[PDB]
Amino acid sequence: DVDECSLGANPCEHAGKCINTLGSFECQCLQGYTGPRCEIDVNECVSNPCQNDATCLDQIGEFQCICMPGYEGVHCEVNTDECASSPCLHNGRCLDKINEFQCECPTGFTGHLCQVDLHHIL
């Protein structure tokens, strides 16, 4: 038997661990690498995991998503609820939009956040 792991170069790419066998050898790849000699950098973005026009970053053994405004989550799958912080004053009804909200103000109030009092005028 030749020990392929004790020759001039590591036959395993991308710093994989070479393990000798009788008649051959095997490679124990680092996370994110595949192939008999760990030749391939797995594309973690190949199944399109980043949603809603997010940018997928193909990294070593992982992906990361960069979300379009108004989206969040690991897959950018969550439409951020802009009504969460109760931005509408005076019990205004809050409507969630994309990276935005709308306030439906009660009688006598107006403005994006229902700030303006009109009760005194009438």
Ligand X SMILES: *[C@@H]1O[C@@H](C)[C@@H](O)[C@@H](O[C@@H]2O[C@H](CO)[C@@H](O)[C@H](O)[C@H]2NC(C)=O)[C@@H]1O
* Backbone conformation region of residue 44, classed left if phi is above 0, alpha if psi is from -120 to 50, else beta: alpha
Query: Chain centroid to CA 36: how far?
Result: 30
Question: Out of Ca ion, ligand X, none, which partner does residue 26 contact, by CB within 5 to 8 A per kind?
Answer: none
Is 58 annotated to bind ligand? yes
Which whole-number Å values give the CA distances from 47 to 43, 75, 92, in the listed order?
Answer: 9, 12, 42
Contact string (CB under 6 A) for ligand X, positions 7-46, x = contact? ----------------------------------------
Per-residue binder mask for Ca ion (CB under 5 A), 3-42, x = binder: -----------------x-----------x--------xx
Length of the chain: 122
Parallel, antiparallel, or unpaired: how do β-strands 101-104 and 93-96 relate?
antiparallel
Q: Is 1 in the site for Ca ion (CB under 5 A)?
A: yes
State the residues that interact with ligand X by CB under 6 A: 53-55, 66-68
